[PDB]
Amino acid sequence: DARDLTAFQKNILTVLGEEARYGLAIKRELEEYYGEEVNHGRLYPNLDDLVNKGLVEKSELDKRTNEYALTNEGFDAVVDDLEWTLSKFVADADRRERVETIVADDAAAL
C-alpha cells in the first residue's frame, strides 16, 4: 500500500493524476508547487522507484523523452489519500461548503 510514500513521491502521483506527462513536464509542475528548483538527480530516481512499485508506467516515446502515467494502482493511491484527507477535512458544514466551492471552481476553470 502506498500510504508510506514520501511527500515528493505522492506529489509526483498527484501531478500524473491530472494527465500523463513527460519527465521534464513533471519537473516543472513540481517546481511550480514547491516554488523552488527540483534537481534531475532527485526527480528521476523517485520516478524509477514509483515505476518499480507499479504505481507509474514509463513510455519511451523518443530518446531523451519519456512519458509517465499513473497505473490503476497509482490512481488508487491518489484516490485513497484524497479520501482519507477529505474524511478528516470535511468535519462540518462550513468545511463541506469550502471543499464544494473548490471543486466547482476547478471544474468551471476546465
Among Br ion, a copy of itself, none, the one that 58 touches (CB under a kind-dependent 5 to 8 A) is Br ion
Q: Which residue has the cell 511550480?
A: 32
Annotated binding residue 100: yes
Q: In this chain, which of 28, 48, 72, 89 binds a copy of itself, going by CB under 8 A?
A: 89
Which CA distances in Å does 11 have to 5, 46, 61, 63, 78?
Answer: 10, 11, 23, 25, 9
Span of 37-45, 49-57, 61-69, 79-87 interacting with a copy of itself by CB under 8 A: 79-87
Amino acid in position 13: L
Please state the residue numbers annotated as binding site: 33, 46, 100
